Amino acid sequence: LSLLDKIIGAVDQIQLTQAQLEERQAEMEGAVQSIQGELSKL
Amino acid sequence: LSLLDKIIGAVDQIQLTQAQLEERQAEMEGAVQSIQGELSKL
Amino acid sequence: LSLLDKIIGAVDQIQLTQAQLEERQAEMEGAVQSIQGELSKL
Amino acid sequence: QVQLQESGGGLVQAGGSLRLSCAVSGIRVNVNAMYWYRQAPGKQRELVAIITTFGSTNYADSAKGRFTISRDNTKNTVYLQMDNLKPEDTAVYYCNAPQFTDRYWGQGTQVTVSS
Amino acid sequence: QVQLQESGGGLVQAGGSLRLSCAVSGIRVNVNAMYWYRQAPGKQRELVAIITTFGSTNYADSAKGRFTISRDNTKNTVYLQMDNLKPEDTAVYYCNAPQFTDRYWGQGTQVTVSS
Amino acid sequence: QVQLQESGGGLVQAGGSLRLSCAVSGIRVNVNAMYWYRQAPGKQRELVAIITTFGSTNYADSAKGRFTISRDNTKNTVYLQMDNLKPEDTAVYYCNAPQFTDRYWGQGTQVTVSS
């Protein structure tokens, strides 16, 4: 197991994790927008 | 296009994306704090 | 300071930052769930 | 600029298949992770599939084993194969790279699935 | 699949020490950042410690210098040494990699600290 | 520890220019992405500009083409050139690396823009 294999596997883990953190943010941004609409309605 | 060029470009994408995910979090943390203040006021 | 040292240090920064962005998300997901419970209770 | 040119949508019957394409310019698909998203009318944009720089994949739960993301490095093009389509898959489908989702979206490709 | 087999918990007195182990299969611990979490009854899961691919560490504030994460690359195992334990450290402790936390959790190892 | 020593602020007229500096110790600026932030009185801290390890840049929308982040690797120093300043740019400006923003902030450098 070379240094480049370690770097590649770290980069791959990071990219997979970044996509998951983005998905979680989008879910939470929808939830916050729903609360904001509830507190803002007439 | 070498393996190192691929790794460098992946790292660069990741760092740009991390700064954007941080900015989005800060925006959402302000929004949540504003809701928490609204639900906590006298 | 070689190119590989730069790549390694970038990867290490990114992994540390990813763990912190995850922790912040978990804190904010608990806060949003608490607000959702407050707005949903009987 | 980055250019994203989506194609391969259309009208398909339920249980049918599509292969979407996004032809990319201004960044290399073998250097960058690339994402497919969809947006149904009046709903929030949903991430559908991702392919990493070194070729790992992940899918939204709504894909549930039906979708396959891939790329051609020479054509600098990202693909989404979609099998066993359902009416609930009707949406405009978009490809992007994560660093540009705050910046630019292409026109997308319309997918309509009818029973 | 990824396998996570946690051990080393038990019943310990306050001021005591434990060393947790997680034996990993299906990914390499010298390639992937690895995390320890804990979950007390009725509470949200808390990140405790992280070790990066190249061996940097960080800890939650609740560890406050008491915990040490490490790994053995040959045994493909991650460790958490926990010194000066307190009743407030009672929880089930879990190891995971960040890309799988949406997907799978092992059984964990129960830690109970009594005065 | 990491040391962050910000300078180059002051009182400047609208339409004027500044060049901020942050002299860094304990991490290398040619290895780490580095960020500039600002904080106006009573407001939340705002990210202003980022430079990645391999030299890509991005800016907040409030910069709108006026700001340029750069670094000197030998002096281990990060710079923010700010052109066509406006009263709304009045704030304390801070440099940091993303992995330390939960941990430590320097004193910053005060920027005041008057008409």
Residue numbers in the entry:
A (entry chain A), B (entry chain A), C (entry chain A): 57 to 98
D (entry chain B), E (entry chain B), F (entry chain B): 2 to 116
Task: Reproduce passages from the article.
This revealed a symmetric complex with three copies of NbB7 bound to the mC1-HR1 trimer, with trimeric symmetry along the crystallographic 3-fold axis. The structure showed clear electron density for NbB7 interacting with the N-terminal region of the trimeric coiled-coil HR1 residues 56–98 (or residues 45–155 in the crystallised construct). It is clear that if this region formed an extended coiled coil as previously observed for apo-mC1 and zC4 HR1 domain structures, it would not be compatible with the packing of the crystal lattice. Each copy of NbB7 interacted with two adjacent protomers of the mC1-HR1 coiled-coil trimer. Several hydrophobic contacts helped to stabilise the interaction, including Leu72 of mC1-HR1 and Phe55 in NbB7 (within the CDR2 loop). One key contact involved Gln67 of mC1-HR1, which formed a network of hydrogen bonds with the nanobody, including with Asn33 in the CDR1 loop and Gln100 in the CDR3 loop.
Using the mouse Cavin1 (mC1) HR1 complex, we immunised alpacas and subsequently isolated two high-affinity nanobodies, NbA12 and NbB7, that specifically target this Cavin1 coiled-coil domain.
